[PDB]
Structure formats: C-alpha cells, structure tokens
Write a protein that binds this ligand. Structure first.
Ligand code: HEC
Ligand code: HEC
Lengths: 125, 125
C-alpha cells in the first residue's frame, strides 16, 4: 500500500486525522459539558482503538516526509516509547469505556491527550 | 467534529483514503498472486469493516464540497442505495474472511469493487 514514501505519508496523515476526530469529539463528555451515554462512548472508543493502531506501520524504513521529524528514525527506541505510551493509554481508555466508568474515562482521556502532545513536541514539525 | 463543511470534507476524504488502502492491498491475494493467509486477511477485513462505516456520517446536511457531486443530496434516496449496496458488500466480504473461504472472498471483493465504482461514476467529480 505504500509504494512511494508519499503514499506512506498520505496514509498516516489520514489515519491521524481520523484518530484525532474520534478522540477530540469526546472532550465535552469528559468535561461534564454533555451527557455521558456509556454505550455510545463505548462504540466510539472501539472505533478509536481500531484507528489508533494504524499510523505506525506507515513510518517504516524510508518514509521520511510530511510533518514527521527525522528523529523518529534516528532515535527509533525513543520514538517507540512515545508510540507505546500512547497505545498503552488507548488500552486504558478502552477499559474505562467498556466498564462504563466516567471517572476512569476522564483520567484515561487526559493520559491519552498528554501522550499525543508528548509525541507532537518531540517528533512533529 | 464537523463544525464547518470543510471539516466534514476533510474527515470523509481521510476515511475514504484509508478504506481504499485496506481494500486495495488485498488485490494480489484475490488474484492468486500472493499467498492467502486467512488470519491476516481476517484481521485486515475487520479494519476495513470498521473504516467502511465512517464516511457516510460526514455527508450530512450542508456538507457540499470536495469532489462530492451535488446529486448526493438532491437524489438522496438513490445515493443511499449506492451506499447500502457498498455496505452490504462489506458484510459479504467480512463473512467470507471470517470463514477463511478464498473463493467467496474473491467474489465478495469483486462485488465491493463494483459498488465503489458505481458510486464513483454517479456521485464523485
Ligand atoms: C507519536 C508517537 C505520535 C502520537 C502518539 C500521536 N501523534 Fe499526531 N502525529 C505524529 C506525527 C509524526 C505526525 C506527522 C505525520 C506526517 O507525516 O505528517 C502527526 C500528525 C498529526 C495530525 C495531522 C495529520 C494530517 O492530517 O496531516 C494530527 C491531527 C495529529 N497528529 C493528532 C494526534 C492526536 C489527536 C493524537 C492522540 C490521540 C496523536 N496525534 C498522537 C506523531 C504522533
Ligand atoms: C458512495 C456511496 C461511495 C462509495 C460506496 C465509495 N465511494 Fe469513494 N468517494 C465517494 C465520494 C462522494 C467521494 C468524494 C469525497 C469528497 O468529499 O471529496 C469519494 C472519494 C474517494 C477517494 C478519494 C479520497 C480523498 O483522499 O480525497 C477514494 C480513494 C475513494 N473514494 C475510494 C473508494 C473505494 C476504494 C471504495 C470502495 C472500497 C469507495 N471509494 C466507495 C463516494 C463513494
């Protein structure tokens, strides 16, 4: 699916846009601004779970481009910990949503958001 | 998530790009050009299933834009049948992949592809 590096960039940017839309739309619920519908949030977090695993395979060898910093590949072990932190946080978010626990969902959501920002600050231009 | 029509366009384009990548990468397997790994295809078709439901909510009222033709909204019943045909075909593809049946997977894949093209020819500029 990624014949040229531009194809990997296009795919990962699309995946990250979708992941961001499914994460960000839950902000009002975790802030108490909109009612918590546990079944709807559980379904949305399943979509996010699915999406959250997709970008990383499109940052393979020779896929420099987009707004991705070169240190993703020169500091691969460190990038892998930023990715793992995020994926571990998605597991926590799923656990909270599957249990229908709003207080745990809020904590997990803030952990996910902090991991998005940590990777942005180190590896996104 | 779609405050302005441009946000709905961005989301749906991202979803359609991902859906296309997960569909298209199975072409060599259904053509007999690459070995069929039933468990890998089952996992990929689950991703595609997930993705295939996402664009349509981003073609709501007042979301004209992108390469979407206006007849999506002026002929809504007809667009809904092109969308349903495609989603019905994704159910067939999932059934084949879950059963590990390559011959059924090939048929279902060609049905999905024909439904992509049918909607493209009528509703994509
Ligand atoms: C590193 C491990 C990351 C984590 C975790 C998250 N993002 Fe990120 N993001 C990262 C990179 C290296 C890039 C640039 C990709 C490129 O090749 O250009 C991005 C990009 C985005 C984007 C823009 C996508 C686009 O349409 O171009 C968005 C909206 C984005 N990232 C959001 C986002 C959110 C909401 C995250 C947590 C849920 C998140 N990212 C995690 C690196 C990493
Ligand atoms: C109507 C019911 C559609 C079906 C079924 C499929 N697609 Fe489509 N697609 C459709 C429209 C109206 C548009 C334009 C969206 C816009 O606002 O611009 C598209 C677009 C695409 C794209 C381009 C996405 C982008 O990055 O801009 C691709 C790659 C695409 N469609 C592929 C595709 C495939 C592979 C499909 C079947 C698996 C498929 N589409 C179905 C309408 C419809």
């Amino acid at each position: 699916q990624f014949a040229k590096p531009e194809d990997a960039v296009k795919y990962r940017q699309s995946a990250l846009t979708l992941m961001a839309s499914h994460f960000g739309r839950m902000t009002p619920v975790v802030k108490g601004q909109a009612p918590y519908d546990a079944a709807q949030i559980k379904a949305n977090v399943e979509v996010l779970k699915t999406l959250s695993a997709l970008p990383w395979a499109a940052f393979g060898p020779g896929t420099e481009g987009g707004d991705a910093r070169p240190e993703i590949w020169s500091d691969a072990a460190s990038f892998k910990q930023k990715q793992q932190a995020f994926q571990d946080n998605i597991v926590k978010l799923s656990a909270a949503a599957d249990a229908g626990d709003l207080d745990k969902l809020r904590a997990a959501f803030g952990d996910v958001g902090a991991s998005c920002k940590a990777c942005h600050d180190a590896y996104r231009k």
